[PDB]
């Protein structure tokens, strides 16, 4: 069975020019831990499959923090990738974040010609890319942003909708108080399909270490903050 994931770096938006070299920035989302690779470094560089013309990244060659072989993608784990290119005039280009799981092994990412909302700046777009045969379950990484936006795409498989909302409160609620109001959080759950009480319970579980002492994690909203934001009653 195939451990490579493929990238079509030939049929691209006009702005990408003509591809010279291809890179794959792959990271863990849930159920696994991967070390950070270097943007467009040795570890990320893909080779062209002469048979098909597709570039590929072999997940079996991933290494863990200790430098040992990771053993590939895990069952019950979520990942994400950015494919980037350097074109023949040395300009960098990159896809949006695309979700990735074991069922994608052997499949191909292509540019759709569409865009998705950039999670850092809602006035900007990323180039949309998705899977040829797995787009129903993996694709552009849906995200909840620092401003409380819910961007288009696929959600992680092994992370619940309530847990994703709680993660967003954890990351953003204290630092962006004015975007994380009870009514925006309310709309976040509705668009993401998370029941507020489920979010509250998920929050309490996923951030028990962090809620323990505030001085260690000022940016982690205490449960009293979370209940009110969710309109819930821990009672």
Numbering used by the authors: 3 to 237
Provide the publication's sentences verbatim.
We solved the crystal structure of Sas20d1 via sulfur single-wavelength anomalous dispersion (SAD) phasing (2.1 Å, Rw = 17.7%, Rf = 21.4%) and then used this as a model to determine the structure with maltotriose (1.5 Å, Rw = 17.5%, Rf = 19.7%). The N-terminal β-sandwich most closely resembles a CBM26 module, which can be found adjacent to catalytic domains on α-amylases and typically binds maltoheptaose and β-cyclodextrin. A search on the DALI server showed that CBM26 from the Eubacterium rectale α-amylase Amy13K (ErCBM26) had the highest structural homology to Sas20d1 and aligns with an RMSD of ∼2.3 Å over 85 Cα atoms. While ErCBM26 and Sas20d1 share a conserved β-sandwich fold, two long loops formed by residues 146 to 161 (loop A) and 169 to 189 (loop B) protrude from Sas20d1 and are not found in ErCBM26. When comparing the native and maltotriose-bound Sas20d1 crystal structures, the CBM26-like fold at the N terminus is nearly identical. In the native structure, the α-helices at the C terminus of Sas20d1 are somewhat disordered with elevated B-factors compared with the rest of the structure, but in the maltotriose-bound structure, this region is well ordered. The Sas20d1 crystals with maltotriose (space group C2) have 45% solvent content and a tightly packed arrangement, with a crystal contact at the helical bundle. In each monomer, the helices (residues 237–257) are sandwiched between the same helical region (residues 237–257) and two β-strands (residues 58–70) of the neighboring monomer within the asymmetric unit and a loop (residues 93–104) of a symmetry-related monomer. This arrangement is in stark contrast to the native crystals, which were of the cubic space group I 21 3 and have ∼62% solvent. In these crystals, there are no crystal contacts in the region surrounding the helical bundle, which in part explains the elevated B-factors. Not surprisingly, the pocket of the native structure has an area of ∼783 Å2 and volume of ∼1350 Å3, whereas this space constricts to ∼521 Å2 and a volume of ∼848 Å3 in the maltotriose-bound structure.
